[model samples]
Target: MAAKFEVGSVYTGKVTGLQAYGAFVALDEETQGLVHISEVTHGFVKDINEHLSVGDEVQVKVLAVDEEKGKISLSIRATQAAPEKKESKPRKPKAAQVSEEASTPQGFNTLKDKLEEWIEMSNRKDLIKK
Candidate 1:
């Protein structure tokens, strides 16, 4: 019998199988779900084997359920705390490297200016045709 699984529920399961794309987690004797590579952790995971193996126990959150297909989507990352954000060095502003000519006020014109130029060009074309 298929086990009842609800989205957002957490469960402790066993790793029953593995593939290049994801790992199969058995939530119970009768139910299993796929934990995709991206959902394995919060950070980069080059190989699922590095993080899980057959018979290994893991805590996973129920991300989705397709009762029609008898498929479930589980996420190990959801069950774990998020990784600490890295402190990155501030980048230097590119304004200092730009030339005065490139930075001049006239270097960039507004869309309104371009629209007026097009209207003037169209008027001139009409006059030339006449």
Candidate 2:
């Protein structure tokens, strides 16, 4: 007899089998589903075996169910909480305070100064070629 599985329902299952593409989970005695490698975790999953093994108990969320095909799509990652974001440290002020100056009128002057330096270098190169 086919087992009834509801979409969006979370169930504690076992990893019954593994393949290159995905892992087979046993939702019940007669109910089995495939968990795609991508759905095994939140981030990049280089290897599924690194995260799951046969007979390992896993909490899976029902993503889809095909009653006709007797197939169910499950996701272990969905049942788990997302990884917390790391806090970034504040940037320290530069000893020269050059950034503060660059934000003001001095920024335009700095560009002009650089343009003059480039022109002088180009002129020198032309003179040396002659």
Candidate 3:
């Protein structure tokens, strides 16, 4: 088997997998990494397969490498960026997980539970009496 690669080093690789958004490349004899959907181009990449196909040779930059867990992060965009714009934006919480909790014994059951308490209280009032 071949040895692992170093992070932040640029290497030439061959595209092995192609998805709608991005492609996966084999960076070295032993390392395969992901080129994220956003990192495939300088501008919008609507269809990644249209731009790149399997067996296409390309150069990529190593964004990260975890030797212990065997994970590598590669980027095609690193070569195209002008430098100053590479500053990362602040990370934020996911919008989908914000409003809802999971189903459990104490979890919010359904929309009916939201109206049940108020509906019972409103029934006892005299406001709608004829």
Number of the top candidate by TM-score?
A: 2
Per-residue error (Å), model 3, residue 64: 1.3
Candidates in order, TM-scores: namely: 0.58, 0.58, 0.52
In model 1, the Cα lDDT at residue 118 comes to: 42
Q: Which segments of model 3 are wrong by more than 4 Å?
A: 1-3, 80-130
Per-model clash counts, in order, read 0, 0, 0
- Report lDDT per candidate: 0.75, 0.75, 0.69
lDDT of 3 by residue, 3-113 (tens): 377777888789999887578898766778878777777666878875567887777888788776555777787765534354554433444365556443233543455
**Regions of model 2 farther than 4 Å from truth:** 1-3, 82-130
Q: Is candidate 2 or candidate 3 better by lDDT?
A: 2
Q: Per lDDT, what order, best first? A: 2, 1, 3
For model 3, what is the error of residue 7's alpha carbon versus the real structure, in angstroms, after optimal superposition? 3.0
Candidate 2 — what's its lDDT? 0.75
